[PDB]
Design a protein around this ligand. Structure first.
Ligand SMILES: [Mg+2]
Ligand SMILES: [Mg+2]
Ligand SMILES: [Zn+2]
Ligand SMILES: [Zn+2]
Lengths: 41, 151, 142, 40
């Protein structure tokens, strides 16, 4: 699930709430993707 | 905050913002529902009366009909064509931070989307940005702006 | 069986628009929620932009059904839908053409074909209702 | 019915929209569409 969440944010750069519910991942997991994303400060 | 709508399609806000990266289409008209934060936007060649009328028609197909719309005191908005247009449509007009934040939210999403890939026109870029803000991004309880606008 | 599962997409011709006679039409097969744009052609560039506008207007579907037009089967469309995680595969969209052209005729003054089409789409989606009193927008998000 | 008639003159919506939105009879709303010259 997290594998598809990561590459989906790379396409749309949605917020952590969208990554958390759509792909069923932890809050700290979804928040980490946004920080780790270079296009999302 | 500003006086917002108690339920969707009651009170809208509309204002133009400038995206200089669009060149000739830098006049980005923005319309946002004050209740659901459902946002519609178009990039046009100007902010004249002809541009506002077409953006208003596009807003209605995208979001429905509101009871009231709040704009600033721009010449185009206070023109007679706009006043008499909203009169036929039975839409009231009144004379701002909600739509200003929408400007920030739109410009923020636009910047993020370049680094993913190249687009064809500002219309292409803007369509993608609007899709994310309205149909992807969600609140703490997991609802999109579209679901709040039609729920 | 529920909204945003299966869409249909095909271009139709409205000669009253002149240069913008290539009207791209996208319709949800469940809710009949309809989106349309008038473009200068039916090329791959036109389809890609119409697809982006469709997504902002209607959301993401699971599958989209088109005819065998060159643009739709092109590699740009195939690889675009691939990143979007959308699968790709006719009477429903043909009826939509009729419904769009019918509303366009009734509405005749507007500024551009974009103006006319926006009004037509507003009526079909947000005004016209079924026997139990629901619009296509309410069925698409209900 | 007065606001339903002139609303159809603007949008030319179907009779079902006129019936529920403005609260008029079916035969009233159907008559407006026939009476409308742009709706054959
Ligand atoms: Mg302004
Ligand atoms: Mg075809
Ligand atoms: Zn990002
Ligand atoms: Zn009529």
């Amino acid at each position: 699930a997290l594998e598809s969440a990561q590459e989906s944010h790379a396409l749309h750069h949605q917020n952590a709430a969208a990554l958390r519910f759509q792909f069923h991942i932890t809050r700290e997991q979804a928040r980490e993707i946004v920080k780790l994303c270079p296009n999302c400060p």
